[PDB]
C-alpha cells in the first residue's frame, strides 16, 4: 500500500480491478478495470430508510389495567422496545415502541422518540398489529415513522416493519430481531482482501 | 555470460546477510525482521539475463510483550509508532519503549533521543492535544498552591 | 506530589503511516519517514486507529530462530548452486581458450 | 488548509465570552505552524466554539507573538447544512503578527471538506500549509522517471 | 556479510555476561540486576548491517528486606542512596547498608 | 524513602528468570554460530572454484 | 517461541511467591491474603503468545 | 578534571567535498584535496551535510 | 588507580572473539593465495605463447 493509497507491487505497478460505485457501493462488472485504491476518506452517515422489528407475543397476556396510556407508567403497557436509528448527521434516535393489548389477537403499537427532549408523548395509535388464528401476522406490519429534529439535523423518515412476527402461547414478550440500514460516521480501521478478490475496508 | 550467475550469487548473498542480521537482532526490543524480494531482469531476449533484489520488506507484526516491569518501559500494541527528536530537531519513529530520564529530566531512550508528545500548559495544566508535539519533561520544581475559590 | 494532588506533564503521541514498508530504517531501532511512507498521522493511544499502551512491559522482536535457521540452510544451498553454475561457465571458457 | 470533524452533540460552552485562558470558553483548539517572509515560525491557534446547532464561531491567535492583541471578535463562522456538509464560511484571510520586526504573513486559511456529524469527538482530520523555513542541502537523488531531486 | 554475524555473536556474548554477572551476584546486599539493551545498525542500505549493544540498564526495584540483628545495619526503603566518601574526598553512592 | 534499622536490602536478582534468560541467550549464541558456519561454507565454496 | 514458556514460568513463580508470602504471614493480625490474576496475551496471531 | 569540573579543549572538524570521486588517494588511508574534488567545505558533525 | 592486595590482574584476551577473527583472517589469507594463483596462471598462459 503506497503513499497514494493504491495497491502496487514491489516495482510500483498498480494493481487493477473492478471498482465499486453507488451507495451502498457494489462491484459493477460492466466497467473496465481501474487501479484499486484504499482512501482514509471518513465514511459519511446514512439516515435510516428501512427498519425491522421481529417479535414474538404471548397469547395469555392480560390487557393493560391503567387506562389511558402513559409512556411514564410501566403498568400502562404490555411491552416496550428500543430501536436506534440515525438521521442525516448520524445522531442517534432511540425509537421506543410500546405494545398494549387491546382485544384478542390485537396489539396497538405506539412509537415515541426518546432522544428528542421536546417531543410530545404519543396519545393516538401509531399502528394496530393484527394476528390471525395462530401467530401468523395478518395486517399492519408496515408503518411510516418520522423522527424528531435534533440539533438541526434532517429528521429521518423510514418504513418500520413487523413482518414475520408471531403471537402464540410464548412465555413472555421478548424482542427477537431489530435491524436498520443507517449508521454513524466511521474512520478506517482495517482493510482486507477476501478469497473472491474483493477488497473490503472495515 | 556470467550475467546470470553473478546476479544469482549476489542475490543469495543478500538473502543470507538478511537472514544473519535477523538472527543477530533476535533480542532487540522493537526489532522487525526483514525479507529480501527478488525479481528477474529479462531484457529483450528470452534467455533470462539474471535476477535482482527489488527491495527489502519489513515484517511489522507485533512481537511478544514481556513485563520487564521498569515503570518507564512502555510497550505498544497494534499499530502506532513512538515519536522522537534528536539534538538537531529531526523527527524519528521507533517501536522500542525503553525510556529513561536524563540529567535535564528529559524522557530519552538509550541513545538519548528525546521522546515527544503533547505538552500541558496552564494552571491547572491541561493536555494540549492540539499543540504541536514537544519533548516531554518531568521538572522537580515544587508545585505552587491554588487559593480556594470553589467549595 | 506530596500534597495529595497530581499534575499532568504531557501525553505521549503516536504515529501511524499509510505505508509501513516504506519507512527507511536509520539504525538504533529507529525509523525515519520518507517519500514512500508518506506523512506521519499523529494521534493518541486508544483513539482513532491506534492501539493502547501497555505499562511496565516491552515489546520483543518478532524474529523466530527456527525459521531463520531453515532459511539460512536453504539460502546456503542456493548460493552453492549458483557457485556451481559459475564453475560450469569457468570450465566452458577454459575449454574454449585451450582450443 | 485545515480539514476537521466536529461533533453535533456538543453543548454550547457556558463561559461567555471566549477567553484563551479559559478552557471552558471554547469547544476545540488546534494549532498550525506557518512561516513568515524571513522564516520565523508562527504557531497560529484556531479555536472552534459552537454557538447554535449548524453554527461554529472560529477565532485565531498567534502563539509566537508576545505582542499579539487578544482576540475579541470572531474571525469567521462555519455553517454546516442539515446533511453535515459545510455550506459557507470555509475560507478566511488571516494575518499573523510581527516578531522582531519581520514582515507579517497574510494567508488564506481554508476549512474545506470539514464536516460536522455524530463522530466520537472533535478530531482534526488534516492540517497543511505551503510555507517553509530556510533549508540546507542534505542529499540528492535521481528518481525512476529521471527527475533529479535534492532533499 | 561476516560483520552481521560477528555483531550478533558479540551482542549474545554481552547478554550472557550480563546474565552471568546477575546470577553470580544473586546473594549480594544492595545489588541491582542488569539488562542489556540492543539496537540495530542500519546505515543507508536496507540490508541491516547488524546489531549493537546500546547499553546496560540497571533495575532499581526495591529488594526484599532481610533482618540481621546488627545495630549498624540499615536499609533504604523506596528511593534513596547512601552517600559515602573515600580517602581522596571523592563522593560515591551505594544502597548497601553494612557499616562498621 | 524511609530507612529501616536493623536490616539490609537484599539483591533483586531472581534466579529462575536468570536461568531462563541464560537458556535463551545460549541458544541465540548457537544460532549466530550457525550463521557464521554457513557464511564460512559459502566462502569455502567460492574459493574452491 | 521461548517467550511463551518464559511468561508461563514467570506467572508460576509469581504464584509461588504469593503463596509463600501468604504462608509466611499465617500469624499476622489484620493481614489479608493475596491472589494473582492471570490473563492470556494474544497479539495478532491465533497462537496466543503467553 | 579532579575539581569536579570539565573543560573543552577543541572540536573535531568534518570536511565534505562536492566530488568525493575526484579525491586523489595518497595512501596510508589518506586522501588529498584536488581541483577535480574541489575546495573542501568545513563544518561540525551532525549538522548540514555532515 | 587503587591497589588490591592478594589479587592478580588476569589477561584481557577473550577466546571467542579471537577464534572468530582467526576464521576471518584464514579466509582473507586463502583469498590472497587465490589471487596469487590467478596471477601465476596469467604468467603461464602468456609464457606458453
Burial of B12 (0-12, 13-18, 19+ CB in 10 A): buried
Rg (CA), chain D: 18
CB contact (8 A) between residue B24 and residue F42: no
Handedness of CA I25, I30, I35, I40 (dihedral sign): positive
User: Angle CA(B111)–CA(B115)–CA(B117) in degrees, nearest 5?
Assistant: 170
CB D105 within 8 A of CB D35: yes
Give me the residues paired with residue E45 across strands. E43
Residues of D in contact with A90 (CB under 8 A): 8, 84, 117-119
DSSP element (H, E) containing E27: none
Give the Å distances, CA to CA, from B113 to B92, C19, F36, H14: 9, 24, 33, 23
Residues in chain H: 50
Q: What are phi and psi of D145, to 5 degrees?
A: -80, 10
CB contact (8 A) between residue G6 and residue F16: no
Contacts of residue B110, defined as CB under 8 A and 6 or more positions apart, other chains included, come to: B98, B100, E37, E39, E54, E55, E57
CB B63 within 8 A of CB B35: no
CB contact (8 A) between residue B98 and residue E57: yes
- DSSP one-letter string for A91-108: -EEEEEEEEEEEETTEEE
Q: How far apart are CA B25 and CA D27, in angstroms?
A: 47
C-alpha cell at position E54: 546500546
C-alpha cell at position E93: 553512592
* DSSP 8-class letter at B6: H
**Nearest residue on chain B to G47, alpha-carbon basis:** B64
Rg (CA), chain A: 23
Q: Is C8 helix (H, G, I), strand (E, B) or coil?
A: coil
Distance of CA E13 to the CA centre of its chain: 15
CB H15 within 8 A of CB H42: yes
Q: How many CA atoms lie within 13 A of I42 on its CB side?
A: 6
Burial of G50 (0-12, 13-18, 19+ CB in 10 A): buried
Interface of F with I (CB under 8 A): 36, 40, 43, 47
Contact of chains I and H by CB distance (3 or more pairs under 8 angstroms): no
Q: Which one of E15, E37, E40 would you mutate to disrupt binding with C, by most C Cβ within 10 Å of its Cβ?
A: E40
Distance of CA A169 to the CA centre of its chain: 28
CB contact (8 A) between residue C60 and residue G1: no
CB contact (8 A) between residue F39 and residue B19: no
Contacts of residue A16, defined as CB under 8 A and 6 or more positions apart, other chains included, come to: A33, A34, A35, A36
Give the Å distances, CA to CA, from B129 to B76, B108, D29: 19, 21, 8
Handedness of CA C47, C51, C53, C54 (dihedral sign): positive
CB atoms within 10 A of CB D48: 23
CB contact (8 A) between residue B5 and residue C69: no
φ/ψ region of E36 (left if φ > 0, alpha if ψ in -120 to 50, else beta) reads beta
- DSSP one-letter string for C27-86: ETTEEE--TTT-PPEEE-TTSSS-PPEEET-EEPP---HHHHHHHHHHHHHHHHHHHHHH
CB contact (8 A) between residue F13 and residue E62: no
**Cα distance from B129 to chain E (closest Cα, Å)?**
31
Q: What are phi and psi of E13, to 5 degrees?
A: -65, -40
CB B19 within 8 A of CB C68: yes
G9 and F CB contact within 8 Å:
yes
Q: How far apart are CA C84 and CA C87, in angstroms?
A: 5
**Cα distance from B20 to chain F (closest Cα, Å)?**
6
Contact of chains D and H by CB distance (3 or more pairs under 8 angstroms): yes
**Nearest residue on chain I to E1, alpha-carbon basis:** I24
Give the Å distances, CA to CA, from D120 to A148, A154, B27, C10, C49: 22, 20, 39, 22, 13
Contacts of residue I47, defined as CB under 8 A and 6 or more positions apart, other chains included, come to: none
Alpha-carbon torsion angle A150, A151, A156, A160, nearest 10:
-30
Q: What are phi and psi of A97, to 5 degrees?
A: -110, 125
Position of cell 427477537?
A176
Position of cell 421506543?
A96
Both ends of chain H: CA-CA distance in Å?
A: 30
CB atoms within 10 A of CB A189: 10
Closest-CA residue to E4 (of F34, B23, B59, C31): B23
* Chain F: partners with 3+ C-beta pairs within 8 Å: B, C, E, G, I
Contact of chains E and I by CB distance (3 or more pairs under 8 angstroms): yes
Both ends of chain A: CA-CA distance in Å?
A: 16
Contact of chains H and F by CB distance (3 or more pairs under 8 angstroms): no
Q: How far apart are CA H49 and CA H43, in angstroms?
A: 9
D116 and A CB contact within 8 Å:
yes
CB contact (8 A) between residue E46 and residue C26: no
CB atoms within 10 A of CB C55: 13
CB contact (8 A) between residue F10 and residue E65: yes
Alpha-carbon torsion angle D6, D9, D14, D20, nearest 10:
-10
- Choose among C54, C76, C86: nearest Cβ to B16: C76
**Nearest residue on chain C to A202, alpha-carbon basis:** C49
Pairing of strands A50-58, A157-161: parallel
G44 and B CB contact within 8 Å:
yes
Technique used by the depositors: cryo-EM
Give the Å distances, CA to CA, from A202 to A24, A189, B61: 14, 6, 19
- DSSP one-letter string for B23-65: HHGGG-TT---EEEEEEE---SSSS---EEEEEEEE------E
C-alpha cell at position B84: 522522537
CB contact (8 A) between residue F35 and residue B27: no
Number of Cβ pairs closer than 8 Å across E and F? 126
**Nearest residue on chain B to E4, alpha-carbon basis:** B21
CB C76 within 8 A of CB F42: yes
- Choose among F28, F35, F45: nearest Cβ to C80: F45
φ/ψ region of G47 (left if φ > 0, alpha if ψ in -120 to 50, else beta) reads alpha
CB D47 within 8 A of CB D63: no
- Choose among E51, E55, E57: nearest Cβ to B25: E51
CB contact (8 A) between residue G1 and residue C66: yes
G41 and B CB contact within 8 Å:
yes
Residues of C in contact with G1 (CB under 8 A): 64-66
CB contact (8 A) between residue C65 and residue G1: yes
CB A141 within 8 A of CB A81: no
Closest-CA residue to F37 (of E9, C84, B12, E15): E9
Residues of F in contact with B9 (CB under 8 A): 46
Residues of G in contact with C64 (CB under 8 A): 1
Amino acid at each position: 500500500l503506497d503513499e497514494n493509497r493504491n495497491l502496487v507491487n514491489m516495482q510500483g505497478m498498480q494493481l487493477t480491478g473492478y471498482p465499486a460505485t453507488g451507495t451502498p457501493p457494489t462491484i459493477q462488472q460492466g466497467a473496465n478495470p481501474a487501479p484499486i485504491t484504499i482512501p482514509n476518506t471518513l465514511m459519511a452517515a446514512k439516515s435510516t430508510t428501512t427498519a425491522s422489528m421481529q417479535i414474538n407475543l404471548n397469547s395469555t397476556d392480560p390487557v393493560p389495567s391503567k387506562t389511558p396510556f402513559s409512556v411514564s407508567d410501566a403498568d400502562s403497557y404490555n411491552k416496550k422496545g428500543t430501536v436506534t436509528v440515525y438521521d442525516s448527521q448520524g445522531n442517534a434516535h432511540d425509537m421506543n415502541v410500546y405494545f398494549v393489548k387491546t382485544k384478542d389477537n390485537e396489539w396497538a403499537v405506539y412509537t415515541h422518540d426518546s432522544s428528542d427532549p421536546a417531543a410530545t408523548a404519543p396519545t393516538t395509535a401509531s399502528t394496530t398489529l393484527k394476528f390471525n388464528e395462530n401467530g401468523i401476522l395478518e395486517s399492519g406490519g408496515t408503518v411510516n415513522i418520522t423522527t424528531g429534529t435534533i440539533n438541526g439535523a434532517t429528521a429521518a423518515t423510514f418504513s418500520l416493519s413487523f413482518l414475520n412476527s408471531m403471537q402464540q402461547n410464548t412465555g413472555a414478550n421478548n424482542i427477537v430481531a431489530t435491524n436498520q440500514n443507517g449508521y454513524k460516521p466511521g474512520d478506517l480501521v482495517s482493510y482486507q482482501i477476501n478469497n473472491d478478490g474483493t477488497v473490503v475496508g472495515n | 555470460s556470467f550475467s546470470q550467475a553473478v546476479s544469482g550469487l549476489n542475490a543469495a548473498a543478500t538473502n543470507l546477510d538478511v537472514i544473519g542480521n535477523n538472527i543477530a537482532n533476535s533480542a532487540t526490543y522493537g526489532f522487525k525482521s526483514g525479507t529480501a524480494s527478488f525479481a528477474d531482469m529479462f531484457a529483450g531476449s528470452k534467455v533470462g539475463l539474471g535476477v535482482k533484489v527489488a527491495g527489502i520488506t519489513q515484517d511489522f507484526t507485533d512481537g511478544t510483550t514481556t513485563n520487564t516491569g521498569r515503570g518507564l518501559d512502555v510497550a505498544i500494541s497494534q499499530n502506532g509508532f513512538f515519536r522522537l527528536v534528536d539534538s538537531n530537531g529531526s523527527v524519528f519513529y521507533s517501536r522500542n519503549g525503553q525510556f529513561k530520564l536524563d540529567e535535564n529530566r528529559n524522557l530519552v531512550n538509550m541513545q538519548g533521543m528525546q521522546l515527544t508528545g503533547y505538552p500541558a500548559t496552564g494552571t491547572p495544566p491541561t493536555i494540549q492535544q492540539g499543540a504541536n508535539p514537544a519533548p516531554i519533561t518531568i521538572p522537580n520544581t515544587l508545585m505552587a498552591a491554588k487559593s480556594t475559590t470553589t467549595a | 506530589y506530596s500534597n495529595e494532588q497530581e499534575q499532568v506533564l504531557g501525553q505521549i503521541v503516536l504515529a501511524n503511516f499509510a505505508n509501513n514498508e516504506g519507512l527507511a530504517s536509520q539504525g538504533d531501532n529507529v525509523w525515519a519517514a520518507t517519500q514512500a511512507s508518506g506523512v506521519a498521522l499523529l494521534g493518541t493511544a486508544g483513539s482513532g486507529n491506534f492501539g493502547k499502551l501497555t505499562n511496565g512491559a516491552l515489546e520483543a522482536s518478532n524474529v523466530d530462530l527456527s525459521k531463520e535457521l531453515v532459511n539460512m540452510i536453504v539460502a546456503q544451498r542456493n548460493y552453492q548452486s549458483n557457485a556451481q553454475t559459475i564453475k560450469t561457465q569457468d570450465q566452458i571458457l577454459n575449454t574454449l581458450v585451450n582450443l
